[PDB]
Symmetry: D2
Amino acid sequence: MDRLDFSIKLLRKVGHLLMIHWGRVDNVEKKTGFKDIVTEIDREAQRMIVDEIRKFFPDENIMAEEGIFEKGDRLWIIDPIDGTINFVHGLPNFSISLAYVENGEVKLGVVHAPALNETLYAEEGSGAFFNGERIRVSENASLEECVGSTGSYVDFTGKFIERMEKRTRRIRILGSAALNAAYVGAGRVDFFVTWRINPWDIAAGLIIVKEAGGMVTDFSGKEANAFSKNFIFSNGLIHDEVVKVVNEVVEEIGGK
Amino acid sequence: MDRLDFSIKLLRKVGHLLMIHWGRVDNVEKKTGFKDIVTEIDREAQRMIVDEIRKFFPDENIMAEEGIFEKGDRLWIIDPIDGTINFVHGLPNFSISLAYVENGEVKLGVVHAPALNETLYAEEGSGAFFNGERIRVSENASLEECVGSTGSYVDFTGKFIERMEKRTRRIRILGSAALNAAYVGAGRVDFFVTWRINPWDIAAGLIIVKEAGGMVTDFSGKEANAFSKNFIFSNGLIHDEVVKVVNEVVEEIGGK
Amino acid sequence: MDRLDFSIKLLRKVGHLLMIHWGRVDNVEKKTGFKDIVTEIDREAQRMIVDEIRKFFPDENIMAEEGIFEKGDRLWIIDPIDGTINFVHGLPNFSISLAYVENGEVKLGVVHAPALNETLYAEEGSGAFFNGERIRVSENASLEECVGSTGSYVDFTGKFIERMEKRTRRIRILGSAALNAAYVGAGRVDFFVTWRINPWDIAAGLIIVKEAGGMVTDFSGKEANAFSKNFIFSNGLIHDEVVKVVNEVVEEIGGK
Amino acid sequence: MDRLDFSIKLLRKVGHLLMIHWGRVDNVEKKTGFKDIVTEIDREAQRMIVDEIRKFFPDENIMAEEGIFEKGDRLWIIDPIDGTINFVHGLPNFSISLAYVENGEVKLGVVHAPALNETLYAEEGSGAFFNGERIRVSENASLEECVGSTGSYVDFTGKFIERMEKRTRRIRILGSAALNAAYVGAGRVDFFVTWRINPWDIAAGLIIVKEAGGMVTDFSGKEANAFSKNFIFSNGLIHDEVVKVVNEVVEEIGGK
Ligand SMILES: [Mg+2]
Ligand SMILES: [Mg+2]
Ligand SMILES: [Mg+2]
Ligand SMILES: [Mg+2]
């Protein structure tokens, strides 16, 4: 609609500002370590976005990674650069994410990977799209004919590989949370699992996976929402096959 | 120039055929099981290349992943699709690799990712390029300022992540060996490790990294060649420690 | 729509076939002269399009430029390559046109420019799009504030350009009818004028420009359909001024 | 090489600045009427180009279209946006142009069309390229085998269209002098004529077409250089005829 179209055009415009600096940001800043960085372009991109929303959606709230952490029954969740590390090194797997949550419910989601010219989006009840055409998660039902994905985490990643590497065609670690969730919605991957992520990393990828007929849940298999800590995105075919392996790894390291 | 230009235009032309089928080939074979496939496109793309190769290079040999394994002083190493699994699922990280090896010497290489519109190539003494512009290897001289990569291998993988997660910013698993290697030459990645690999998977990558001022060696740390089993590519500023870690990852599982 | 989504996916896929021979076609045949040519690719592309339509819509008629001139209630109009001259020479302004005419009126229409990655489409009562985002006709209400365009015609073009130049910013001759009409819908040009044209050249553009909010009439101002001979696509704001000048041109050349 | 690479990367970088505002330029200032305008984006982009050149070649001269007119042995000719009108309306045919003129003679030219992803360029003595690929002018030896092109001139155009349309397949009016000239070098067009012009309009085009094996002369047939106001670019196989028509058109209006 108005909101969806606005979001698509906004992220597509800002995407170009990011291209100016892609792989060329000399000022890398650490937030809570060397694996968790931010740059001046993350902020500039966020300002560009936040300002347009604040302009057309005057009395609505914003929750943006870099700083703005408001609350509201009408909240826009923004990730100026999902995959800042990639962005800095020059890898194409980074994106801009914009979800519009109403009453804690994701009503719209859009992910835009600039260097790839891929714009995945979904509005509630309208289905998922990719640059205008319909997308639906894969039909794959056998883990052996599946390609799953994960993000670079503590001891989780390396272990989740060990467990999965056997019953799976191949595992991917691309670099963009939002983009990886959206890829399942587009049928490119079979499932995506995250750990200790904020809502700006998954709010958009959540409605896009479900509107594309997939499944989005926490590690307990109980349907997840924008405010869940663990995330499992899947085509809804080999979901449980994954729910298990994940907890198998979680227990081994420490959990419950 | 002659063979360089030839090679770029050719792979670029072939990339488009791949695009017609990319993500839409549900007729998969297994060259050795699920973890290793081939498609008619693999075959159909390789054909379109080999044909052209002879049309202008009669008295020369050819080596393609699936089908031709000739040998000679004027050889061409072809890989119709590097990342067939990706190509099959709809992932952008797949490429076409081609190297001209004269007297056992890689005289030039070219990697082309059609979905990403990336063409990385290099000629002996001419330096490396990326779509016409020069590319050098990264300057990040410390593991805490690096992003590494490797392919999905038996135990080496999940055990390489664990053994290097706290070492580097991130470890990526993209899918295409030729592309991944070309990326360290591009400085998008600081190092890439490949275990148990064929010549057509690194032939081009090899000369691209070295021409881009990087390092390519076996695990023994000795200068690597088109014919080696395990490779390591880097900016030559963090090779030592990587060799070290690589040489200490096979330990935990085995492989003498 | 599954019909529109069907249309977008089919032309996008076929666009890669075209990309293989774009600028690399050696055998150009004259249909009625050196200014009206055709190639084998036009046919190959068309065949790819027709077989898919006939497979998923077995009882609907087809009217494709190169040969298939059926007629009916459920009709598919096709121009395998709008701008074969451009396509042959290597210019990017060439496209694949597809419209669905029902009981005389165009229900949907998509235009795909492969080299340009531009897919403009519209389904009746749903608005016009450009790669997933909504587009609308321009807002230039003054001719001196406009950019117009036409095709390449015998007498018409020259007189036109003369009788318009001193009254508009500039007139453009890009080379693809469908693409040009669709651009009026995208708002990139303010009006497009075609003379002694064919239905497959304007069916898709007709609905896109109408859905985009503009106007499409014949040279007399009378609204038009896929079957009129002459056309005028505009933003609706400058139309009269255009129809006037056009006839001043039909007047000098001749008519009756 | 030092200068060429620097030029290619700078333009591609500035290219994205342009993409942010492409088709969304609010305030258009008039230079010499609605026929010739400039926008703050032209200035904003020019400043970004000038900025880098001052930094790496501080002791060199600059001649930029929008306000900088220096003179010297080492000189850089610049056009922030060639095809501003196109840029404004949202047409993809616009580009950045940069030439380095050492000792009165241009030895390097770069033309980048951001919206098209086309970087054509040429360093004196090394030949013409297009995104790394090598290019050479066309081989069409007869006008009926060609596709010519012109700029939008108040009297020239219409006449040229008239005395040239029955003689050739089609005459194109694209909207970007630098790109149009680079196109003859790319062989996408057989000839291009420009009436009334400045060094920043065709300095880069000049060298590219020459390194591509074609010819650039003033209307009189006499060779042409960065400093002339009549230009005719061609594949050098139909040049004579074009100069013919060009002159004839001049007689239909006025001159000497
Ligand atoms: Mg972020
Ligand atoms: Mg292969
Ligand atoms: Mg046609
Ligand atoms: Mg300009």
